[PDB]
Amino acid sequence: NIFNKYPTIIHGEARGENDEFVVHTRYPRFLARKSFDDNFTGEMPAKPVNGELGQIGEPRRLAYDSRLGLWLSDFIMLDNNKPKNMEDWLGQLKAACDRIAADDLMLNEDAAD
């Protein structure tokens, strides 16, 4: 309820860090690391962002691939509650990641002049 005073998507940075970060303040709420492919082109597609959720690395970790060059990883859920259904939680997490990827493209789109 206090989270609702915040914007839905917060884009983050840190000193000395090449990777970026994100906070999602609506359900499901989380902190995540933003990392990038080397051919990220940034052009805004007519089609909506449709990314993939997967397990990656060692040991296996949840990660999101936007397929437009942005990745989301090191998820930390900020909700204490556990979701009743695992399938619907993963779906909600993925949709949130898609919105974030779209919002990130607009951060770049706003800026390039």
Task: Give yes or no for residue 89 binding other proteins (CB under 8 A).
Answer: no
In this structure, what token pair is assigned to residue 40?
């990220």
Residues of this chain that interact with a copy of itself (CB under 8 A) are: 2-3, 5-7, 9-17, 21, 23, 25, 31, 33, 74, 76, 78, 80, 103, 106-107, 110
Q: What is the contact mask toward other proteins in residues 31 to 70, using x (rule: CB under 8 A)?
A: --x-xxxxxx---------------xx-----x-------
Residue of 100, 97, 107 whose CA lies nearest to 52: 97
Instruction: Check the CA dihedral 104-110-111-113 and report its sign.
Output: positive
Query: 39 touches which of other proteins, a copy of itself, none (CB within 5 to 8 A by kind)?
Result: other proteins
Which CB atom, from 87 or from 109, has the smaller least distance to a copy of itself?
109
From residue 75, alpha-carbon distances to 30, 33, 53, 96 in Å are: 6, 7, 12, 12
Looking at residues 3 to 22 of the shown chain, list those that interact with other proteins (rule: CB under 8 A): 13, 18-20
We find the least distance from the C-beta atom of residue 93 to a copy of itself, in angstroms, to be: 15
**CA separation for the pair 36, 20 (Å, rounded):** 9
**CA separation for the pair 37, 51 (Å, rounded):** 14
